[PDB]
Design a protein around this ligand. Sequence first.
Ligand SMILES: *[C@@H]1O[C@H](CO)[C@@H](O[C@@H]2O[C@H](CO)[C@@H](O[C@@H]3O[C@H](CO)[C@@H](O)[C@H](O)[C@@H]3O)[C@H](O)[C@H]2NC(C)=O)[C@H](O)[C@H]1NC(C)=O
Ligand SMILES: *[C@@H]1O[C@H](CO)[C@@H](O[C@@H]2O[C@H](CO)[C@@H](O)[C@H](O)[C@H]2NC(C)=O)[C@H](O)[C@H]1NC(C)=O
Lengths: 52, 156, 163, 119
Amino acid sequence: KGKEVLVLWGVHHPSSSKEQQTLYQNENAYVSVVSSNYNRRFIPEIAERPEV
Amino acid sequence: FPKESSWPKHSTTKGVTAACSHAGKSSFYRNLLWLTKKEDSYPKLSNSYVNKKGKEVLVLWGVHHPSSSKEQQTLYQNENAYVSVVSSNYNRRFIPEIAERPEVKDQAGRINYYWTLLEPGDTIIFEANGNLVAPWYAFALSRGFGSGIITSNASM
Amino acid sequence: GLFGAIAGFIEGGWTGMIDGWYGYHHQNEQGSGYAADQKSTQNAINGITNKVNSVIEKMNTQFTAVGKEFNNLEKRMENLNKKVDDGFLDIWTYNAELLVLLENERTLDFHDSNVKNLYEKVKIQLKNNAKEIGNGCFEFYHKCDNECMESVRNGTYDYPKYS
Amino acid sequence: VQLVESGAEVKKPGSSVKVSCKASGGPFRSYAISWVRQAPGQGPEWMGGIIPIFGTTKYAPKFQGRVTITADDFAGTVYMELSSLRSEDTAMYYCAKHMGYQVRETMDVWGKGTTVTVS
Ligand SMILES: *[C@@H]1O[C@H](CO)[C@@H](O[C@@H]2O[C@H](CO)[C@@H](O[C@@H]3O[C@H](CO)[C@@H](O)[C@H](O)[C@@H]3O)[C@H](O)[C@H]2NC(C)=O)[C@H](O)[C@H]1NC(C)=O
Ligand SMILES: *[C@@H]1O[C@H](CO)[C@@H](O[C@@H]2O[C@H](CO)[C@@H](O)[C@H](O)[C@H]2NC(C)=O)[C@H](O)[C@H]1NC(C)=O
């Protein structure tokens, strides 16, 4: 586009292993977001938090 | 968390060290509690607290990183352990790092200290498979402007 | 001074005049004596207290201000904090010193102006029935008793009666 | 302006007392300040006064060796100290403005009063 581009995304942390199975079918999952000056790997944290 | 009724399945008085010496024998902090396995068993931990005091509450805890896998085995009986501390605006998972470090005060392991603030009506939850130093006393705070912290050698 | 009266053509002060800043000294057959001028002293006191009160009012009270703490990986913010503190201290020190230095000179010129005005007020009254001697002093041609003196020190000296 | 004295005091003979007076407005004033005494059932009595800038103080010949009047300037307060209290220093004490910078006979603003009892 010849200009600066703003991009946004999100990562979901479920509450149990059953929820993870019914949502994504994989137990050990990861996300990799890679740019020319950005780099990160994300791994879910599966725990139970107070409800909001 | 009362000491006499909150931890029936763990050892509440064996958590003393020689890096914290009082009157010549091994000791430990007073507002915290270093839990330890009881007869080769460290069952999963789950505790919660709701703020009903009507004020802000300051909570503090710690996480222990031993020096070897033998130390971890004799302390917590589990090799792969984790801690989860979960609030309504706080969230973190901790995993121990088992490595050997230059000795400071006779210790090759480490302990990391964390704190958080709870709002009125809010809940906080602790869960652990090991390596957790649980809180014992908490503080309900009252704010006010016109105070400070000064460093001074003058007499009182 | 800018007006040439104090340490000028009147070269010294009076330690015998205790109740005012400016005044008269008279001499006739009854006797001698000093006497302060109340209107000039009152106006000067009003002005001086106004100036002091304004100087006090333009500076406000300072409330609680204590320092902060940083670790070994926060040197830039610590340096910025030091910069801000030092800059504000320097600015306020400069302001205070300059204000005092500049107000003192105006205060010293005020009294010189007041003395000169009093001298001119008396001189225009006497005009012709008195000789100017030079040291802020007037010598009468006729006989001036206590009523004459008290009328001179009031502004109601009657020129035609004494020719 | 408004003149406000301190509270009421009760003492026993042989001691001293210190009363105060606070005026509204700027800390520095261009008028003299006097202290007046009035026993129950008699007319007032002038005790002494103080001058704004020259700092001179004047006292009545009766109250010569006992009274001491001082000022603070930056606070706006005037203090009067009376020593060797008898059983006759039991009256009402007033703080009085003067108009000009000299202690003349014309006091145009008075305070409210303060009772000092001796027993
Ligand atoms: C509370 O503060 C005191 C005072 O700082 C601590 O006591 C001091 O701790 C240091 C660190 O271990 C001691 O230094 C070491 O002493 C040994 C014994 O002689 C020596 O061999 C080492 O080379 C090193 O110098 C120090 O002696 C000790 N006492 C004093 C008076 O400084 C104390 O540990 C702190 N904590 C508690 C829980 O008391
Ligand atoms: C001193 O000067 C004042 C100012 O003029 C004189 O005041 C006048 O006094 C007469 C009575 O003597 C009154 O009728 C006038 O109304 C006053 N004038 C003002 C402006 O108030 C005063 O009399 C003079 N003193 C003497 C002794 O002559």
